[PDB]
Design goal:
Chain C: A positive regulator of the alternate pathway (AP) of complement. It binds to and stabilizes the C3- and C5-convertase enzyme complexes. Inhibits CFI-CFH mediated degradation of Complement C3 beta chain (C3b). This is part of a larger assembly, with chains A (124 residues), B (215 residues) and C (163 residues). Chain A is mainly beta and 124 residues long. Chain A is 0% helix and 50% strand. Chain A has one domain. The radius of gyration of chain A is 14 Å and the shape is globular. Chain B folds into 3 domains: 58 residues, no CATH class; 85 residues, no CATH class; 58 residues, no CATH class. A 4-stranded mixed sheet of chain B has the order 4-6-10-9, with no helix packed on it. In chain B, strands 11-7-8-12 form a 4-stranded mixed sheet, with no helix packed on it. A two-stranded antiparallel ribbon of chain B has the order 1-2. Classes of the chains: A mainly beta (124), B mainly beta (215), C mainly beta (163). The structure holds a molecule of 3 linked components (NAG-NAG-FUC), a molecule of 2 linked components (FUC-BGC) (3 copies) and alpha-D-mannopyranose (12 copies). The site of a molecule of 2 linked components (FUC-BGC) has 6 residues of chain B, from loops.
Chain lengths: 124, 215, 163
């Protein structure tokens, strides 16, 4: 139903900053709660950050809290992940996710729509 | 000291859900005046929420009812195996209830077969059991609740094989006794089947309704 | 009548979790049978599931700390549109009363005995303290009993001697 396109990945030095963006389908955008996931080499996919349909409620993994910030632009059908103080353990394919939420302030950890991903590599 | 204010409200979200209730919203920004060098903070909320109604009921998956009564422990196209060393079979049935609006069907076997002996109306020698554990104080909340314990004439079950190994696919069957026997025993207090005794419960607390208690 | 609609019934506590908002009828909020509703913040959160009995609550503390007492536990019929088993409306309850036993005896008390002789004065010069003790064993207390009052009176004494 909804399609998701990630952008903004690349090769960053250790400690540097990177801002990812995720474009979703325009007509159904404000229906879905959205979030960020990542999958490192040799590891399972793990939760990174979540944002509600409002953009007012956020949730973060403990490994990225204080360094990463998820935001939502309900004018331009995008969400963003501002990643500061990047470490070599943050190297992963970063996935945007979309999930149906009944309330507009609910953050989800289970999602049924997934993008193709963007590669983020952090070099020391 | 610049006083910030709200801008135009954006497009309303369509109703997210296809059944029941959902929540739609509108997003506004504080982008036209903008509080500069201090001021306030636009006064209010940058987010309104609203309930949308689709007026169509939702899928509800069916649930299993409780199992029925066991069938009699007889053989089809025969007679009966009462008071005899013949293991038989018996069946039991369930009913799926509550499935509406393309919900998921009940998962599992709707039938249950187990192996059995038959002591239906069988005269068996018996012995008086010891005193049972004291029951509940009945009636709760009513006038003068009383407990009750009882001794009953427990039948001496015959020493049959509890495990019967059939052939075909070499299936061994846990065989259990079925039926209401006729236990024979000496009288205790003018009674042959069950002699009970009641005792009143002491310092009975009054029943207060939890919705009437919170309020 | 409009009602507050919630997205989740906790069931372990009977609370209304995740507010969907208000100003909406009960029939529409309970189309999704996983939802729940309540009127304002007064309480009684009722799920939109078909009515089923809840879990039996924990036993109340025993009505006395001694001997045979009695203790209660409740169970509330929770749901919407229908009845529980036993012609029970949503909101009505069912109780079980059980005889409990925290302890066995409850204290009866004892009486004092004859007073012991006055102890000598606590100092040999100027002023001191004269103590007078008795015992609680006429009759002896059983289980948790105790004698009323004190077992040792203490007064002053003048030795009439200079240090
Ligand atoms: C068939 O019987 C076995 C044996 O266990 C039970 O046998 C009865 C004759 C009686 O002694 C009863 O007290 C006993 O529990 C069942 O296997 C398991 O046995 C262990 C050992 O005691 C029990 O603790 C388990 O409760 C029991 N059941 C399990 C693991 O489900 C067996 O289940 C039973 N049924 C079938 C279909 O084989
Ligand atoms: C849309 O069509 C309806 C007829 C239902 O089949 C809906 O299914 C329900 O979807 C909501 C979330 O959208 C869930 O809460 C329900 O569990 C599910 O039954 C469908 O979405
Ligand atoms: C539980 O412990 C016992 C040792 C008592 O001290 C109980 O206190 C009260 O004792 C009076 C008798 O004077 C009774 O009337 C009360 O029923 C009992 O509550 C205590 O609760
Ligand atoms: C009894 O006889 C008196 C005449 C004193 O000699 C007493 O000793 C005194 O005890 C006090 C304390 O109680 C001390 O301060 C004095 O130093 C000491 O003389 C005696 O016990
Ligand atoms: C925004 O909100 C309301 C108008 O919708 C007023 O309080 C004020 O204009 C504020 O800027
Ligand atoms: C949104 O709501 C109304 C318009 O419908 C106005 O108060 C104002 O434009 C606000 O931004
Ligand atoms: C029937 O069988 C047993 C009770 O005899 C339980 O598994 C359950 O209640 C089922 O409905
Ligand atoms: C069948 O088996 C016994 C009766 O012999 C009980 O456990 C119950 O009635 C079940 O349906
Ligand atoms: C029960 O009562 C006595 C044992 O207490 C015996 O006469 C016999 O066992 C009867 O069944
Ligand atoms: C019940 O009464 C006493 C114990 O309270 C004993 O005679 C026996 O255990 C009987 O079952
Ligand atoms: C009932 O009374 C007491 C427990 O309250 C015990 O003697 C026994 O468990 C009996 O069944
Ligand atoms: C209370 O009674 C039994 C457990 O003691 C169950 O039927 C159920 O949990 C009920 O709430
Ligand atoms: C009441 O009885 C005991 C505690 O007295 C426990 O089994 C449980 O708390 C039950 O509710
Ligand atoms: C002890 O004190 C007096 C007697 O000395 C009475 O009040 C009572 O008998 C108490 O036990
Ligand atoms: C102690 O007090 C007086 C004597 O001093 C009497 O009332 C009684 O002997 C008590 O034990
Ligand atoms: C203390 O006083 C006198 C002795 O000095 C007696 O009446 C009795 O021993 C009292 O306890």
């Amino acid at each position: 139903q909804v399609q998701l396109v990630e952008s903004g990945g690349g090769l960053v030095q250790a400690g540097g900053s990177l801002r990812l963006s995720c474009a979703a389908s325009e007509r159904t955008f404000t229906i879905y709660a959205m979030g960020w996931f990542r999958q490192a080499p040799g590891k399972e996919r793990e939760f990174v950050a979540a944002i509600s349909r409002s953009g007012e409620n956020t949730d973060y993994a403990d490994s990225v809290k204080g360094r990463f910030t998820i935001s939502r632009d309900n004018n331009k059908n995008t969400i963003s992940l501002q990643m500061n103080s990047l470490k070599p353990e943050d190297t992963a394919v970063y996935y945007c996710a979309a999930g149906r939420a009944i309330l507009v302030h609910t953050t989800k950890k289970e999602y049924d729509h997934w993008g193709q991903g963007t590669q983020v590599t952090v070099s020391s | 000291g610049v006083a910030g204010g709200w801008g135009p409200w954006g497009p309303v979200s369509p109703c997210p859900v296809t059944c029941g209730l959902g929540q739609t919203m509108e997003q506004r920004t504080c982008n036209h005046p903008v509080p500069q060098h201090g001021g306030p903070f636009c006064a209010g909320d940058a987010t309104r929420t609203h309930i949308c109604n689709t007026a169509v009921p939702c899928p509800v998956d069916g649930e299993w009812d409780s199992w029925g009564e066991w069938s009699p422990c007889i053989r089809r196209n025969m007679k009966s195996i009462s008071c005899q060393e013949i293991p038989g079979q018996q069946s039991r049935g369930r009913t799926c209830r509550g499935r509406k609006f393309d919900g998921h069907r009940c998962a599992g076997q709707q039938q249950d077969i187990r192996h059995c002996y038959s002591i239906q109306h069988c005269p068996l020698k018996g012995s008086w059991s010891e005193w049972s554990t004291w029951g509940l104080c009945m009636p709760p909340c009513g006038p003068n609740p009383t407990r009750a314990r009882q001794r009953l004439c427990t039948p001496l079950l015959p020493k049959y094989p509890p495990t019967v190994s059939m052939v075909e696919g070499q299936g061994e069957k846990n065989v259990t006794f079925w039926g209401r026997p006729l236990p024979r025993c000496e009288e205790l207090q003018g009674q042959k089947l069950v002699v009970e005794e009641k005792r009143p419960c002491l310092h009975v607390p009054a029943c207060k309704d939890p919705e009437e208690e919170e309020l | 009548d409009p009602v507050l609609c919630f997205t989740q019934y906790e069931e372990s506590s009977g609370k209304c979790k995740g507010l969907l908002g208000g100003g909406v009828s009960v029939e529409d909020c309970c189309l999704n049978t996983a939802f729940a509703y309540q009127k304002r913040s007064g309480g009684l959160c009722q799920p939109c599931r078909s009515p089923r009995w809840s879990l039996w609550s924990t036993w109340a503390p025993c009505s006395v700390t001694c001997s045979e007492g009695s203790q209660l536990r409740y169970r509330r019929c929770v749901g919407w549109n229908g009845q529980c088993s036993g012609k029970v409306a949503p909101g009505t309850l069912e109780w079980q009363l059980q005889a409990c036993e925290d302890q066995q005896c409850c204290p009866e008390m004892g009486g004092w005995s004859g007073w012991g002789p006055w102890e000598p004065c606590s100092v040999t010069c100027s002023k001191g303290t004269r103590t007078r003790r008795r015992a609680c064993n006429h009759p002896a207390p059983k289980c948790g009993g105790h004698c009323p009052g004190q077992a040792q009176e203490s007064e002053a004494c003048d030795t009439q001697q200079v240090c």
